[PDB]
């Protein structure tokens, strides 16, 4: 109820000033359910990739953080195969004042500069630390398979 107006007002503002490399909107008419599309940062082995992300809003939103999941596959130390994202905004540093926009920007930041020390996929984390060139290469190839087409 309170959550419903807040999401409605958050969507309006998001479509006024959209985030830098990103697009988001309701899934049809369930405006408690949002799809966002993120372009791979250019500094990244993800450039030229289109990544789809799913957004569901908890009952006590904006006091509980939103549920944010990749739909596109990514070779990343902090995104697993189920599309779960290890991001502090999304778990513990959430605030009632942050927004979907902020979360999308933070996800782009992760894609540019992964955080291997808080791994969700330890093999990928290990590869990033010990063989970075293999990480960068394998990411280009995953981006090419599942994002660019």
């Amino acid at each position: 109820a309170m959550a419903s107006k807040r999401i409605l007002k958050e969507l309006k503002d998001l479509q006024k000033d959209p985030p830098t490399s990103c697009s988001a909107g309701p899934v049809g008419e369930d405006m408690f359910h949002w799809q966002a599309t993120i372009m791979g940062p250019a500094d990244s082995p993800y450039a030229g990739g289109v990544f789809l992300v799913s957004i569901h809003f908890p009952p006590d939103y904006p006091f509980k953080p939103p549920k944010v999941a990749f739909k596109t596959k990514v070779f990343h130390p902090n995104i697993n195969s189920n599309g779960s994202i290890c991001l502090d905004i999304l778990k513990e540093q959430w605030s009632p004042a942050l927004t979907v926009s902020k979360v999308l920007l933070s996800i782009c930041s992760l894609l540019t500069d992964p955080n291997p020390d808080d791994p969700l996929v330890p093999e990928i984390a290990h590869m990033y630390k010990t063989d970075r060139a293999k990480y960068e290469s394998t990411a280009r190839g995953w981006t090419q398979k599942y994002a660019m087409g």
Binding site: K9, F63, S95, P96
Partner: protein, 77 residues
């Protein structure tokens, strides 16, 4: 278009009872209260710790809102 100062960082609507936290930031009383009740002791907009968890009304902003509403034929919040 509502001036952004007159809106709550949490609710994003025009504020009815604007109150100020020790950080110096202003919020709608019910929202900021709810968050403190949840047990958090941080200013949500600046994410820094709060010295004290006390809500002081922001009567000057209340006045400036009530006036803008009367000016722009809007219902008082």
């Amino acid at each position: 278009i509502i001036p952004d100062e007159f809106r709550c960082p949490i609710s994003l609507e025009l504020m009815q009872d604007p109150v100020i936290v020790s950080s110096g930031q202003t919020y709608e009383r019910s929202c900021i209260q709810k968050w403190l009740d949840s047990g958090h002791k941080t200013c949500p907009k600046t994410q820094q710790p709060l010295s004290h968890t006390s809500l002081t009304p922001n009567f000057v902003l209340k006045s400036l809102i009530s006036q803008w509403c009367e000016a722009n034929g809007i219902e008082l919040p």
